[PDB]
Ligand binder design. Structure first.
Ligand code: 54B
Ligand code: 54B
Lengths: 192, 194
């Protein structure tokens, strides 16, 4: 049985544990786990996480990029991933975000869709530019909903140690963290 | 070669950048880009990113070796000498003189350095280490706001800057020059091959 995003908003703790500092960072693990699941599948050798000045957060990998095709009713596949809950991580974050943007680069084209106010699409998946055929990947940027979380301040140390673990488990893949609020940055990379 | 302060440039701006209208305004852009192109041309860095920020300021970022972070006489940073002393390697100080503020950011050895100038190139901080970076990352980022009390117009033209970077890519070859307009969220790249 499928559910909408309002189902996650209704009982947020049931999907991310809680709505405090810990739960806020669960949002980060969800998106990153998808980039890591791409690397593990053999695509992309780096995953860059960026904490922006506006308080939002960005995860960018260099994998194959999420599918750019359509489904039923001319609804993009990426829209199905972010708005239909198969109750899975991508839609949960979108549901608990005041806005979210997904940027896909594949086949020499760059696509983009934006969501707002708990994952309501405000644009479709649009082709907005071109790129080299060698450049591929997915960029997700989201702003955690302040009317749901008790805190929307991402912790540099917390995200830091977790990327260190994920780097250690993956091997051969560099995960980075860049904080544009404080001009700090750090990388993790393990090899065997 | 008698050396001068920046007040000499503010006094006669047209003598250093041609004019104080739209044309002269964009000369400021060419000066900073020419330093990035001159670093690229020396074999360091393969891309040069220009950004028109929302605040009206302009940013040029290359990925070269980064300007010297060392000191000269009196504990004065070398980058400060480049931007505040006119040798009337002259373009950087001219731009600074005709800016209400300007920032220089150097990235080397995994560290990020930064100095800021204000009111016609008067230093308001020294060169301080402000953050960290990757050991693989190197380069110079210059961001400035053209002084409105000198220029009759301070609105950078997207079309104008676009065309010039297109030429530069063509003369250079093997170097990618980009332009990003955050006012309108448009962007374009150029790269030529031989
Ligand atoms: C910053 C976050 N970035 C990303 O999450 N990028 C990303 C996402 C995916 C996918 N994620 C999903 C979904 F979220 F689980 F629904 C479906 S496809 C995929 C993905 C693509 C393909 C695929 N592209 N072209 C093709 O023929 O097959 C296949 N699987 C993908 N997934 C699956 C398994 C690894 C990756 C993420 N997994 C959670 C789901 C790749 N990259
Ligand atoms: C967005 C604007 N970007 C830049 O301005 N990047 C930049 C600037 C420089 C320099 N520029 C100058 C100056 F402005 F001409 F005074 C002095 S050093 C240099 C530069 C560095 C070095 C150097 N670094 N470490 C070392 O041992 O020697 C040497 N030359 C540099 N210059 C000279 C010649 C090529 C390049 C730019 N030229 C304008 C000045 C490199 N990149």
């Amino acid at each position: 049985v499928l559910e909408g995003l309002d189902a996650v908003r209704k009982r947020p703790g049931m999907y991310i544990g809680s709505t405090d500092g810990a739960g806020l960072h669960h949002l980060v693990w969800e998106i990153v786990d998808n980039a890591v699941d791409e690397a593990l599948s053999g695509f992309g050798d780096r995953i860059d996480v960026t904490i922006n000045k506006d308080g939002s957060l960005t995860v960018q990998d260099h994998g194959r990029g999420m599918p750019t095709g359509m489904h039923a009713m001319g609804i993009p596949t990426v829209e199905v991933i972010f708005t239909i809950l198969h109750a899975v991580g991508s839609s949960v974050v979108n549901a608990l975000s005041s806005w979210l943007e997904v940027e896909i680069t594949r086949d020499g084209a760059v696509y983009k869709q934006r969501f707002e106010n708990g994952g309501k699409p405000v644009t479709t998946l649009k082709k907005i530019g071109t790129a080299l055929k060698s450049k591929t990947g997915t960029k997700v940027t989201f702003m955690p909903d302040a009317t749901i979380f008790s805190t929307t301040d991402f912790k540099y140390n917390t995200i830091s140690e977790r990327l260190n673990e994920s780097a250690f488990l993956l091997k051969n893949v560099t995960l980075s963290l860049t904080d544009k609020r404080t001009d700090e940055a750090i990388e993790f990379h393990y090899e065997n």
